[PDB]
Amino acid sequence: KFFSYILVYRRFLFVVFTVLVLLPLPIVLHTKEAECAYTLFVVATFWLTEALPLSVTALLPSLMLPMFGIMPSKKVASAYFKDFHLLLIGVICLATSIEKWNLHKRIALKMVMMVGVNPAWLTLGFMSSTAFLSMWLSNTSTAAMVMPIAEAVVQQIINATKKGHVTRKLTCLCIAYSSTIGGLTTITGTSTNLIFAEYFNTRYPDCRCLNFGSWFTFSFPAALIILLLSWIWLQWLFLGFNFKEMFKCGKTKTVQQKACAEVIKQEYQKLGPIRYQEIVTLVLFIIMALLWFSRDPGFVPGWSALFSEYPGFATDSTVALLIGLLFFLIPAKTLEIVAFDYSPLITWKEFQSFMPWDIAILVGGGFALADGCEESGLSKWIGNKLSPLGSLPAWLIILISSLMVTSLTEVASNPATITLFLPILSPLAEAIHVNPLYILIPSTLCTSFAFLLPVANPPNAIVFSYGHLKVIDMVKAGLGVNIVGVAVVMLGICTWIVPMFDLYTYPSWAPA
Amino acid sequence: KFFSYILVYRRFLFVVFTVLVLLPLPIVLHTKEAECAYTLFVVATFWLTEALPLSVTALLPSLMLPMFGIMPSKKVASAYFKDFHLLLIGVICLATSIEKWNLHKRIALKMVMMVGVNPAWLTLGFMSSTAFLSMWLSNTSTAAMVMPIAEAVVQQIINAEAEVETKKGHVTRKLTCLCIAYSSTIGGLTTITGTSTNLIFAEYFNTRYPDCRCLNFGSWFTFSFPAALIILLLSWIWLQWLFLGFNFKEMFTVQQKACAEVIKQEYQKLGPIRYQEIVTLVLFIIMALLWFSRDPGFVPGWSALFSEYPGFATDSTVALLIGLLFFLIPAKTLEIVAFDYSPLITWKEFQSFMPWDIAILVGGGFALADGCEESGLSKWIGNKLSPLGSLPAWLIILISSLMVTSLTEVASNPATITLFLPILSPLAEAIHVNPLYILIPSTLCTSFAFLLPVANPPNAIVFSYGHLKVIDMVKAGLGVNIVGVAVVMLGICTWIVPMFDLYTYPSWAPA
Ligand code: NA
Ligand code: NA
Ligand code: NA
Ligand code: NA
């Protein structure tokens, strides 16, 4: 009669309880650190439990910080839009054109035709293609783009069910994990790397280490090993290894194999000859990638030397916008008889869909919360309280931080997790007198390792929404993939990250 | 077969032509302020003739300014989100619940039964109500609170025009949009706290001239209300003529009652007011009460409770505080109850119905205005006004008013006056005629931003309703701006000089 109503209004009562129980913290401490800690705790509680929508919670700092007097609303509003958002707009413009003109379908079908219908090699081909695509596009868009095609290919291979369901589960999980793994290789690949680069360059403006080439040259060896080991782990866990049928060349002819291959060939033929919209989209994709790579990598100043009087004004977001806004200008189809006009090959109505406005607001809210934590002085207090932790061995601190971030990223979004630890792990670095990158790189790499739960990151939810995967089947694979990723990151940090970044000494661009 | 190809691909060719033909401007002319002028000209050309979508054009400053070296891309990006965007998020959270539970339909159908089936007087009633509301709350807030109600009224009248048995509806919708957008005359000019432009002018005047205590409530109203009422009436007549026919006969009936019966039938079809609609209406009233009671000027508001962090909490804070309650207040319930409840609005229902077009458009306008400040293009234009001491008394007034009302069409009203006011005050002190005589017309004409909806936030909330034709807005804005400038000049010439003594040099101004 009374307890029944409590379990129905769980979210409302939990939000009210969270707001009221943490109230004694700023009510009687009369410090800005306490008020910002109250705001941080409320935002973290609502992001972890998802009592409110993530983007609604991200708007709380713009409501609490101005009222607590920590920083004016004009200053909070200026932190909701950064170069991350411009890059996201420019890349969503490209992704909308790829999705609209079925270029991804052509690439996926050609990859399936070239690799074959062997379930051991088909999964590797899908993972490689999805990881390469996620190297440039966002993980969420890559997962939402490849998966509808992977399922379509798999269900037509099965038709041409003790083995079908496990095959579709394996295909779901391989795409979900490969999007994330491929997003690690580049700064622009995922939102976590973009947020980390923005925070690192704002907090340490005297460091010129993080560019495209330097990030790639250490994130590719780790990501390739992680991808190969995850493919092996998934193949063993779901289907198992049959080496004789796998390593054999095209010599044993089976009727049901060409029966499956003919369906894929007929689908690719029904796709039709390549249209010029697909060619233009592919050319613009290649140009965007080449301009991202051509901005100074370290050995040759590609086109940053062209603007070598305003350093740092034109960035990768400028390249993304320049390429993406061309998708609003290049004509695609006509309609003269009626309207005497053309179509711009991407309409703004089509761009407004598929554009992650919620992710933009979430990242802006995280950046505003970090700015409030820096302005109020909470970051300095946290760094001072973690000063005695500097007597421990260095590697243990990085291991513990990476494990904590990895554990907390399985239930909270990657952009939220990375924004709640950079203002904590960054001040902690100089409280030990150790290179901040030596802690930040493993932490930002382990923030992306979100494979256990569907709520961990949008790539997991997109794949889980198809209903093929159970929670336990996903957790079993995510545990192994996450262990592989953490082991590879820690091996790289101890082996090949320290020569190029010189992590064993204290840098000259860090505060003393 | 060539002329047809040129005519069909006219937008692409025009974009390329206008990018390439203004290209001599940055390469020549010292390459310092001509780059931002080139960017401004290209963006304005794309805005006037919609060769590209307005939100795509607004993203051009994020490209052109960083590449020209005017300002870094990090600084340009931060300009696409300000307090206008927080206020817009809050008011759209309110409006999503207003339109989801059909509260706008109840209000529209009650107003149609009560006042104004005739569109001619309905437009006047809408303009008068919006202009009275804008005297107290804000211009942006007022253009956002009443616009859904006006759209609902027009849509209900269009539906009821079936008479139980499409050109006029579209022009009526355009007229109702522009009348709400342009109703900044009585509200926003007659009170210091009506708009931020008058607040900035008052704070600058009381600081630079602390011996002059003439500017306050009442004295501002006494000289501004006569001008604002004439501007409102003339703008109503101009809009009625521009969008509707010249109606003269019947204003000195089966069709009216044929629609009144349909309105009555559609009002009783709604039924009793629901819980969700009551909650939405209560939050609507609370948001307006908190906007009004922040700092009314004639009595301390709740901003006095925060008299340690002045200006940290704005109207955007109120909008967020009220709008974020729509995501947690229960609306419906999902042995009878299955597992939980649902909120008034969800994020899926908010992401749609959100003018993401207007957010980017206003952000691009803000970025272009900031780029015009980083590179001293706006400072150059303002400094082209100072060497005009030869003009005896009034040509300076006219030139300054025209320059400010032309530059306010691309920059925000606060930023437009913040530039010219410290330029006009020294010019008015170099001459010996009453710096108020110089500053009042320019302050009034700064708010006359009726062209280019990118400038005035009231012009963008209205523009966010699907009537995306800038030229239909340009035609009306030109006439409204001309009327406003003429009425301001008439007021300066006739009725403002007695109460401020504008024909003699005062004692509170430096000699
Ligand atoms: Na990616
Ligand atoms: Na995560
Ligand atoms: Na106003
Ligand atoms: Na303006």
B77/A317 touch (CB, cutoff 8 Å), yes or no:
yes
What single-letter amino acid sits at B271?
Answer: G
CA of A459 to the centre of ligand 2 (A): 10
User: Does residue B341 sit in helix, strand or coil?
Assistant: strand
Q: Which residue, chain included where needed, has tokens 């509200």?
A: B187
Ligand with smallest separation from the Cα of A144: 1
User: C-alpha dihedral over A51, A56, A61, A63, to 10 degrees?
Assistant: -110
CB A60 within 8 A of CB B323: no
Q: Which two tokens stand for residue A314?
A: 């034109």
Question: How would you label B243-266 residue by residue, b for 16+ Cβ within 10 Å and e otherwise?
Answer: beeeeeeeeeeeeeeebeebbeeb
Residues of A in contact with B69 (CB under 8 A): 307, 309-310, 313
* A67 min Cα distance to partner chain B (Å): 6
CB A69 within 8 A of CB A399: no
Sign of CA dihedral B117, B119, B120, B126: positive
Cα(B327)–Cα(B350) distance, rounded to whole angstroms?
10
Residues of A in contact with B15 (CB under 8 A): 329
Q: How many residues in total does chain B contain?
A: 511
Cα(A323)–Cα(A320) distance, rounded to whole angstroms?
5
In eight-state DSSP terms, residue B185 is S
Breakpoints of chain B, after residues (C–N > 2.5 Å): 165, 252, 334
What single-letter amino acid sits at A246?
Answer: M
Partners of residue A334 on adjacent β-strands: A342
A396 exposed, middle or buried (CB, 10 Å; 0-12, 13-18, 19+)?
exposed
A86/B67 touch (CB, cutoff 8 Å), yes or no:
no
Q: Which two tokens stand for residue A157?
A: 């291979």
Q: How many CB atoms lie within 10 A of CB A269?
A: 10
A62/B317 touch (CB, cutoff 8 Å), yes or no:
yes
Cα(A188)–Cα(A185) distance, rounded to whole angstroms?
9
Helix axes B254-268, B147-160, angle to 10 degrees: 120
Breakpoints of chain A, after residues (C–N > 2.5 Å): 160, 335
Cα(B120)–Cα(B247) distance, rounded to whole angstroms?
9
Kind plus residue range of the DSSP H or E element containing B331: strand B330-333
Q: What are phi and psi of A318, to 5 degrees?
A: -65, -45
B62/A12 touch (CB, cutoff 8 Å), yes or no:
no
Cα(A412)–Cα(A424) distance, rounded to whole angstroms?
17
Angle, vertex CA B28, rays to CA B22 and CA B30, nearest 5: 130
Q: How many CB atoms lie within 10 A of CB B347?
A: 18
What single-letter amino acid sits at A339?
Answer: A
Of the candidates A363, A356, A361, A370, the one whose C-alpha atom is nearest the C-alpha of residue A415 is: A363
Q: How many CB atoms lie within 10 A of CB A375?
A: 16
DSSP A200-236: HHHH-TT----SHHHHHHHHHHHHHHHHHHHHHHHHH
Residues of B in contact with A328 (CB under 8 A): 52-53, 56
CA of A191 to the centre of ligand 2 (A): 11
CA of A147 to the centre of ligand 2 (A): 19
Q: Which two tokens stand for residue A451?
A: 């494979």
Q: How many CB atoms lie within 10 A of CB B385?
A: 16
A393 exposed, middle or buried (CB, 10 Å; 0-12, 13-18, 19+)?
exposed
Partners of residue B341 on adjacent β-strands: B333
Cα(A38)–Cα(A64) distance, rounded to whole angstroms?
9
Helix axes B167-181, B470-493, angle to 10 degrees: 40
Question: How would you label B273-286 residue by residue, b for 16+ Cβ within 10 Å and e otherwise?
Answer: eeebbebbbebbee
CB A263 within 8 A of CB A148: no
Residues of A in contact with B339 (CB under 8 A): 8
In eight-state DSSP terms, residue A274 is P
Q: How many CA atoms lie within 13 A of B417 on its CB side?
A: 25
Cα(B190)–Cα(B128) distance, rounded to whole angstroms?
13
- How far from B165 is each of B109, B169, B279, CA to CA, in Å? 20, 17, 37
**Determination method here?**
cryo-EM
* Chain A / chain B CB contacts < 8 angstroms: 167
Q: How many CB atoms lie within 10 A of CB A401?
A: 19
Cα(A59)–Cα(A80) distance, rounded to whole angstroms?
9
Residues of B in contact with A30 (CB under 8 A): none
DSSP A313-380: SS-HHHHHHHHHHGGGTS--SB---S---B--SS-HHHHHTT--HHHHHHHHHHHHHHHHHHHHTHHH
Q: Which two tokens stand for residue A22?
A: 């943490």
Q: A73: Cβ–Cβ under 8 A, 6 or more apart, which residues?
A: A62, A65, A66, B83, B86, B312, B313, B314, B316, B317
Cα(B137)–Cα(A406) distance, rounded to whole angstroms?
48
Of the candidates A375, A305, A130, A8, the one whose C-alpha atom is nearest the C-alpha of residue B330 is: A8
Q: Which residue, chain included where needed, has tokens 């262990």?
A: A483
Cα(A295)–Cα(A213) distance, rounded to whole angstroms?
9
Rg (CA), chain A: 24
CB A223 within 8 A of CB A127: no
Question: How many Å from the N-terminal Cα to the C-terminal Cα in chain B?
Answer: 73
In eight-state DSSP terms, residue A3 is H
Helix axes A83-100, A316-325, angle to 10 degrees: 40
Q: How many CB atoms lie within 10 A of CB B299?
A: 8
* B84 min Cα distance to partner chain A (Å): 9
* Residues around ligand 4, an ion, CB closer than 5 A: B 408, 413, 449, 455-456
User: Does residue B210 sit in helix, strand or coil?
Assistant: coil
Sign of CA dihedral B217, B223, B225, B231: negative
Q: Which residue, chain included where needed, has tokens 């009453």?
A: B434
What are the residue boundaries of the structural domains of chain B, listed by start?
1-78+360-371, 82-101+278-354
Cα(A238)–Cα(A240) distance, rounded to whole angstroms?
6
Distance of CA A438 to the CA centre of its chain: 21
Give the best residue of B5, B140, B312, B334 to mutate against chain A (max A CB count within 10 A): B312
Give the best residue of A318, A319, A345, A363 to mutate against chain B (max B CB count within 10 A): A318
Angle, vertex CA B399, rays to CA B396 and CA B402, nearest 5: 145
Question: How would you label B180-192 residue by residue, b for 16+ Cβ within 10 Å and e otherwise?
Answer: bbbbbbbbbbbbb
CB A383 within 8 A of CB A333: no
SS3 string, B53-115, reads CHHHHHCCHHHHHHHHCCCCHHHHHHCCCCHHHHHHHHHHHHHHHHHHCCHHHHHHHHHHHHC
Cα(B259)–Cα(B109) distance, rounded to whole angstroms?
12
Question: How would you label A406-442 residue by residue, b for 16+ Cβ within 10 Å and e otherwise?
Answer: bebbbbbbbbbbbbbbbbbbbbbbbbbebbbbbbbbb
User: C-alpha dihedral over B91, A72, B447, B209, to 10 degrees?
Assistant: 150
Question: How many Å from the N-terminal Cα to the C-terminal Cα in chain A?
Answer: 62
- How far from A135 is each of A452, B60, B359, CA to CA, in Å? 22, 26, 29
Q: Which two tokens stand for residue A212?
A: 């495209």
Of the candidates B163, B151, B162, the one whose C-alpha atom is nearest the C-alpha of residue B122 is: B151
Cα(A87)–Cα(A82) distance, rounded to whole angstroms?
9
Sign of CA dihedral A163, A169, A173, A176: positive
- How far from B282 is each of B90, B91, B277, B285, CA to CA, in Å? 15, 14, 9, 5
In eight-state DSSP terms, residue B249 is S
Helices and strands in chain B: count of H runs, count of E runs: 28, 2
Cα(B168)–Cα(B188) distance, rounded to whole angstroms?
31
Q: Which residue of A has its CA nearest to B15?
A: A329
Cα(B511)–Cα(B501) distance, rounded to whole angstroms?
17
CB A106 within 8 A of CB A406: no
Cα(B225)–Cα(B202) distance, rounded to whole angstroms?
17
Q: Which two tokens stand for residue A393?
A: 């061995």
Cα(A162)–Cα(A176) distance, rounded to whole angstroms?
23
Q: What are phi and psi of A344, to 5 degrees?
A: -80, 15
What single-letter amino acid sits at B60?
Answer: L
User: Does residue B483 sit in helix, strand or coil?
Assistant: helix
Ligand with smallest separation from the Cα of A189: 1
Q: Where are the beta strands (DSSP E) in B132-206?
A: none
Q: Which two tokens stand for residue B67?
A: 């590449």
Of the candidates A432, A469, A437, the one whose C-alpha atom is nearest the C-alpha of residue A452 is: A469
Helices and strands in chain A: count of H runs, count of E runs: 28, 0
Q: Which residue, chain included where needed, has tokens 């020209």?
A: B68
Cα(A73)–Cα(B406) distance, rounded to whole angstroms?
30
In eight-state DSSP terms, residue B302 is G
Q: Which two tokens stand for residue A268?
A: 């690719």
CB B185 within 8 A of CB B235: yes
Q: B18: Cβ–Cβ under 8 A, 6 or more apart, which residues?
A: B42, B45, B46, B51
- Facing residue for A59 by CB, picked from B89, B333, B357: B89
A225 exposed, middle or buried (CB, 10 Å; 0-12, 13-18, 19+)?
middle
A59/B324 touch (CB, cutoff 8 Å), yes or no:
yes
CB A85 within 8 A of CB A272: no
- Facing residue for B78 by CB, picked from A8, A82, A314: A82
Instruction: Locate all alpha helices (DSSP H) within B185-314, ordered by sequence.
Output: 186-189, 196-208, 219-243, 254-268, 275-292
A143 exposed, middle or buried (CB, 10 Å; 0-12, 13-18, 19+)?
buried
Task: Name the resolution in angstroms.
Answer: 2.7
Q: Which residue of A has its CA nearest to B323?
A: A56
CB A186 within 8 A of CB A193: yes
Cα(A169)–Cα(A470) distance, rounded to whole angstroms?
9
CB B184 within 8 A of CB B134: yes
CB A52 within 8 A of CB A46: yes
- How far from B16 is each of A17, A341, B10, B46, B361, CA to CA, in Å? 59, 16, 10, 11, 22
Cα(B1)–Cα(A375) distance, rounded to whole angstroms?
65
Distance of CA B361 to the CA centre of its chain: 13
Cα(B334)–Cα(B358) distance, rounded to whole angstroms?
35
The region that residue A433 occupies, defined by phi over 0 for left and psi between -120 and 50 for alpha, beta otherwise, is: left
